[PDB]
Each structure stands twice: as C-alpha cells, then as structure tokens.
C-alpha cells in the first residue's frame, strides 16, 4: 500500500524545496495527484480485506476514510490561501508540512494492521494539530484551546495503552486479523468491565460524548480555518474507525453496559442540537451540530447492529464532509468581517448570491435529505435503533426536530434576509471560495448515486 | 420625547377609525360614525384641571383597546402589511458599483462616470460638511437626532450621502 | 406645531440632491454598448421567414418551434427511454411487471382462442 504512503512522505521535500511563488501551486497540484492515487483503494473484495503487507492493510471500512483524508489535503491548502498569504515563505513551507504530516499520520493510522501500530499513529496526530491550533490560531483563548484538546484526548488514550499491552500479554497478538479470528467473549468480571472501560473511553472522549465534549467548542471555534475543518472532518473519526475494530472482542459486555453511553448520546444529541440552535457564534453551531451527528454514530456502534454499522460509515463521511463546507463557508464570512457573529452579517445573497447557493445546498445536506448518503446512513441508524428498541425513535425523532430548526436558521440570518447598510467590506466572491465549494459539495451528490462503496464493510 | 395630549389623541384618532372603517367596511356607515366620533371627540374639548383631562384620557385608551378592531386593516406597503419590507430583497447598496468589473465597467460607462462625480462631490464636500457640523455642534455632542443644514455658502447639508443615496423604495 | 428653518432647508437640500441622484440615475441613451455577439444563420433564415407577418407564416414558425420542441425535448426523449426499458431493463427479469388484464367471458385468448366460460343466466333484474 506504499503506493500512497511514500508520495506523501516525499511531499515534505517537495514543499520545502519548492520555489517562493509556487509552493501552494506546487502543494495542490500534487496533492490532487495523490488523491486519485488513493482513489485506487476503492478496490475491495467481498469480506477479505486488502492485506498489502505484514503491517499495512485496508478494508471496506478504512478505504472511504483514506480517500476522504487524501482528497481533503488539497482543500485546506486552497482554504488557507487567503488566511496565510501575508506570512513569510519559510513558515509557509512549515505550515504545509504540518498539513502533509497530519494527513501522513492519518493514512497510516487508518491502515495499520497491528492495534498498537494504530495506537502509536492514532494519537500521533495531536502533535501536528496542537501546532496548528495553537501557533496559527487567531483569537486569544487559542492558548487554552490546545491544552483542552490534547489533555482530553490523552486522558483516555493512556488507559487504552495499558489495556492494549495487557491483551498482547494475554492473547499473544493485537493484530486485527488474529484478534478477529481468535476473538473470545469478554466476561462480566469487574476486571473485565474495567478492561472494557479502558478500551472504549479512549475513543469516547474524542467521539465526543455528552459531557466529554468541551474541547470541540473551545478548539474548532478558535482553530485556524484549515485546522478547524480537518479536526471535524476526519480527526473526529479515528475513534470511530478504531471503535468498530476493537468491538470484536468486547462482546458480550457491550450489550450489557453500553446503556450509560447510549443514554448520554441520546439525551446529548437532543441537548447538543438544542443548544446549537441557541449560540451567538456561527462557528460554534457547526461544532455543536457536529457532535450531534457524531453522538448518533456512537449509538450505531453500541447496538453493533449490521444496519447500525451501515450508517456509521456513511454518516461519518457525510458529516465529515458536512462540517467541511460549513466551516469553509463560516470562514468566508469571517475574514470579510473579522468576526464570527451571525447577527453581524445577515442576508448575504443580496451581496453574494452564489455563496448563498452553496450555503443552502450544504445546509440541506446537513438536513439529511434523500437520496443524499447523509440520510440513508443516518436512516439506517434509526432502523437499527428501532430493532434495539422501538421507543428509541422519539428521542432521536426529537433530533429530526432541532437540526433543521437550526440548520436553516443561520441561512435566514446569514445568507437570507436583508443587509446592514454599514458593511462596505463585503465584496465579490473570489473564485477560490466557490471553487473549493465545488470540490466540497459536488462529491457528496456524486457518490450519493452509488452508496455501496461508502456504505461500509457490511455489504 | 414625551407625549402630550395633542400628540396622543391624534395617535388615538388614527387607530380608532382604522378599526371603525375595518369594522364597517362599507364607506357610508363608517362615514356617519367617523364624523360623529369627531363630534364625540370635541364634545369635551374644554375640560378642567389636567387631572380629569388625563383621567378621561385613560378611559379613552381602555375602551379604544377593547374597541380596537382585533383584525384591523393595515396597508401592505406600511409596517404590518403584505408589502411591508417586501422590496428589501431587491434592496442593494451603492458600493457594489465600485467593484464592477472593468469589462463590465466599460459596458455602463456613462452611469459609472456619473457615479464618479457623485462620489466626487461626496468626498470634496464630506470634510467641509462635517467640520462645520462639529463646530456648530453644541457641547456634549448632539442634544437630539437633528441635522444642521448647508446654511453657509458652497457646502452640502451635513450627513447627506446615505440619505441622498438611499436605495429607491421600489428597487425592482 | 412647525418645521424649523434648520430642518426646512435640510429636507429641501436633501430633496433635490436625491432628485438629482435619480436625475443622474437615468439609464443613459447610449445604454447598452454591447460588443458583437454570435448570430446564428438558421434562426436568421427562420425569423426572416415570418417577418412579413402572414397568418400562415406565423403559424408555421410556431409550428416549427413546436416541431423542434418535439424532436429533441419530446421525440428524442421517448427514443432513449424506449431504448432503455424494453431493451435493457426488460432484458433484466422482473424489472417491468404487468398485471394480467381482466379477461372477460366471451373473449378469446390470442393463442388458444379459448372462449373464457360464457356467462350463465341472470336473475333478471330490470327497471
């Protein structure tokens, strides 16, 4: 699988040795090239995963993530074109290195064949993002933003490490294939429930879980524009991809003690969606809506119904995209006005009509309107939950109450309505914003026509 | 500022028959009523000490509010109607004229030439209109939301641009 | 009760300044200078066909407007769906399902000609 790994490793000499003017022209022109190279990984067998080597392998679950990450990397490049034009060239090369290194650690992480190799490359991603969030951030609190990020993720990461080595000494291998074939029932002993607690709370923290979610509002809001998309789009989803992987040996204790988490997600998803409708900062909305959708997929894995694993993958990519346009859009209002208050800028179609067109179709994508894979994945979660419990619908049905209650709400107060006559700052839309808008939303309608590949391994 | 009987009963008489015409619909009925409220309104325009003048006024508002047509008639173009703020969707500021594309700038040359001299008289008269306004401004800033005129020679009436360059009420 | 002279000249100075704005806002007689476009020749022949305004010529042109509307917004569309279902979709079994028609006594099936059992006598109701 070094088809994709090495050219990204080499991309660091590429950007570092590139000339003064190109750099970003260089950075994109080859990151797109790597994207179609990673588009090859769409070749799955039925159920036997693509085992490329002893340490690297991929399956129907990992591959959609790989294409998401690799194709994402050009997007923050062009997204960061505006924000970081003033800075000198050397840090420009360093910033791209952080982006490439981040995507580098992502692709190996999703493709590791040994659990600890996944873990070492799991939390290896906070190191570059901590640099991105803290150094290149904009507002003052960004200092405390990074601390909240790493400490939250680490507070659960270390228990996983102690658990992982324990399984190594107990079973003899943490490799996905061996642990899957030699999967054994995790008994109900108090020792084993804490083992389950160790192997789950790590992903739950950066899931996030209701109550264990403060980092995203304190990080995504003050993260740099490029950094903000990457966190929500994919760096949310390491825990998820790990979660469906480690859940092969935690049975049957999962069906017995997932209730507190199924609780905290269900109430949290309504709670997060409701508070999402009542923030004064637009950037907090995509952050709070993100966890609301993200709280949904934790429900999927807990019931571990085949249908639940169906929508877990689809919603992951769907939301992972969905947060991307909104953060891109929410960015576009910011630097134009140097504020993230939706109240300050209202009715932008009277000034930016094309931006509004992109705004609404991303919004209705967040609405989970079929045939978009946002709904079908999200819908499969509903069906699995009903199989788990018929009553489940009402609490989550309350989530199909708040989403559109806010997901069109900023539309009618950011892109829709009248304009304040004092902001002459608002200007025409540079084609970059619409162009990246095109590569952002056009895919989601494209693979909508063909949902089986991003459906997941349960096909 | 504060409202006095004259300002307030003129406010009263506006709404009162707005309910009455909406109550009667047909002109002639409301016609006889509207002109008899007029006599009913002047039937006491000689009252003694202002306490009664206020107290009878209190009786006027209460019977007005429960005599207020629950579904009154509102002209659409005015606040509360169908055409209220209807054309704000077509409302667009004047600074979008500046960022016009040069190829498109040469497709409307005369109109961009006129905006050039319109923004020209904006700039050459802005500084004189404001400096005169501050010197004639009483201490403590403005004491009311008033505006001094171009009272002197060769000047523009201060703070005129936006209200002169206000978008037309039918931007269509 | 009483426009102060201050605000009297304010309105009037505001009035004709905005009136002069609209006076300067008129669409110019020059408008619009348009660089050359592309004028297709078949539509040139088609519009030139009906300039004289005879009732038959105008009807034929709108009939041709309907005609090309048939060929490539109706007639080509029925072609490519016809090619789609009975040649590709029905090439796949059970894609197109058909309820058997309500075959009725006295009728003959095209192959066997069997007269589906002729209806027996009636209890003879009439009004």
């Amino acid at each position: 699988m070094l088809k994709i790994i090495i050219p990204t490793t080499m991309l660091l000499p590429m950007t570092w040795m590139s000339k003064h003017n190109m750099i970003w022209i260089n950075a994109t022109v080859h990151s797109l090239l790597i994207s179609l190279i990673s588009l090859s990984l769409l070749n799955q067998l039925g159920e036997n995963s693509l085992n490329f080597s002893l340490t690297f392998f991929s399956d129907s679950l990992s591959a959609p993530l790989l294409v998401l990450t690799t194709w994402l990397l050009p997007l923050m490049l062009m997204a960061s074109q505006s924000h970081l034009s003033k800075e000198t060239t050397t840090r420009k090369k360093l910033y791209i290195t952080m982006l490439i290194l981040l995507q580098l650690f992502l692709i190996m992480t999703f493709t590791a064949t040994e659990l600890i190799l996944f873990y070492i490359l799991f939390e290896a991603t906070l190191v570059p993002t901590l640099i991105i969030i803290t150094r290149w951030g904009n507002q003052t609190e960004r200092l405390n933003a990074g601390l909240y990020f790493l400490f939250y993720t680490l507070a659960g990461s270390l228990p996983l490490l102690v658990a992982l080595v324990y399984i190594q000494n107990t079973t003899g291998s943490l490799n996905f294939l061996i642990i899957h074939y030699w999967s054994h029932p995790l008994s109900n002993s108090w020792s084993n429930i804490f083992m389950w607690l160790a192997c789950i709370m790590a992903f739950m923290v950066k899931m996030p879980l209701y109550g264990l979610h403060l980092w995203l509002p304190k990080a995504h809001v003050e993260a740099p524009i490029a950094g903000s998309m990457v966190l929500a789009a994919v760096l949310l989803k390491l825990g998820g991809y790990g979660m469906m992987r480690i859940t092969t040996i935690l049975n049957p204790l999962t069906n017995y003690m997932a209730y507190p988490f199924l609780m905290l997600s269900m109430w949290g998803m309504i709670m997060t969606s409701s508070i999402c409708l009542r923030q004064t900062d637009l950037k907090s909305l995509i952050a709070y809506s993100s966890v609301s959708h993200m709280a949904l997929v934790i429900v999927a894995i807990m019931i571990q119904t085949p249908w639940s694993f169906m929508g877990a993958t689809a919603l992951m990519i769907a939301h992972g995209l969905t947060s991307s346009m909104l953060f891109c859009l929410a960015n576009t209002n910011y630097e134009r006005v140097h504020s993230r208050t939706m109240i300050l800028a209202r009715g932008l179609q009277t000034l930016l009509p094309l931006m509004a067109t992109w705004w609404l179709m991303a919004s209705l994508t967040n609405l989970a309107l079929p045939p978009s894979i946002n709904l079908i994945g999200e819908l499969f979660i509903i069906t699995a939950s009903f199989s788990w419990s018929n009553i489940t619908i009402i609490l989550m049905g309350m989530n199909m109450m708040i989403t559109a209650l806010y997901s069109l709400y900023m539309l009618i107060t950011t892109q829709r309505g009248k304009y304040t006559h004092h902001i002459n700052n608002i200007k025409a839309s540079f084609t970059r914003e619409n162009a990246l808008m095109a590569l952002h939303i056009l895919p989601l309608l494209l693979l909508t026509l063909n949902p089986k590949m991003i459906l997941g391994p349960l096909y | 500022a504060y409202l006095t009987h004259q300002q307030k009963v003129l406010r009263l008489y506006k709404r009162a028959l707005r309910h009455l015409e909406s109550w009667c619909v047909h002109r002639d009925k409301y016609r006889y009523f509207a002109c008899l409220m007029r006599a009913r309104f002047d039937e006491h325009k000689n009252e003694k000490d202002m306490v009664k003048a206020t107290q009878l006024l209190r009786q006027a508002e209460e019977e007005f509010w429960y005599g207020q047509h629950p579904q009154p008639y509102i002209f659409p173009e005015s606040p509360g109607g169908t055409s209220y703020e209807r054309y704000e969707c077509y409302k667009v500021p004047e600074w979008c004229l500046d960022d016009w594309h040069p190829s498109e700038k040469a497709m409307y040359p005369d109109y961009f030439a006129k905006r050039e001299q319109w923004k020209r008289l904006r700039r050459e008269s802005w500084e004189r209109e404001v400096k005169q306004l501050q010197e004639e401004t009483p201490p403590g800033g403005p004491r009311t939301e008033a505006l001094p005129p171009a009272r002197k020679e060769g000047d523009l009436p201060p703070l005129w641009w936006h209200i002169v360059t206000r978008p037309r009420e039918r931007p269509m | 009760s009483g426009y102060t002279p201050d605000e009297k000249l304010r309105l009037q100075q505001l009035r004709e300044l905005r009136r002069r704005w609209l006076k300067d806002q008129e669409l110019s007689p020059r408008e619009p200078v348009l660089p050359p476009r592309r004028v297709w020749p078949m539509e040139q022949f088609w519009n030139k066909f009906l300039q004289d305004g005879a009732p038959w010529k105008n009807v034929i042109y709108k009939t041709y407007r309907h005609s090309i509307f048939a060929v490539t917004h109706v007639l080509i569309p029925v072609w490519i769906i016809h090619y789609y279902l009975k040649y590709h979709v029905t090439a796949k079994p059970y894609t197109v399902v058909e309820r058997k028609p309500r075959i009725f006594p006295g009728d003959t099936i095209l192959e066997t000609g069997e007269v589906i059992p002729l209806m027996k006598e009636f209890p003879d109701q009439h009004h």
Binding site: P353, S429 | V92, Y111, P171 | -
Partner: peptide, 12 residues
Amino acid sequence: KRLFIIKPSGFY
C-alpha cells in the same frame, strides 16, 4: 423613462 437597477458584481 427608465431608471438604473444596481446588482452585485456578477462576472466573477
């Protein structure tokens, strides 16, 4: 007589 209607710059 016909007045002028202003729009956002569109060519971009």
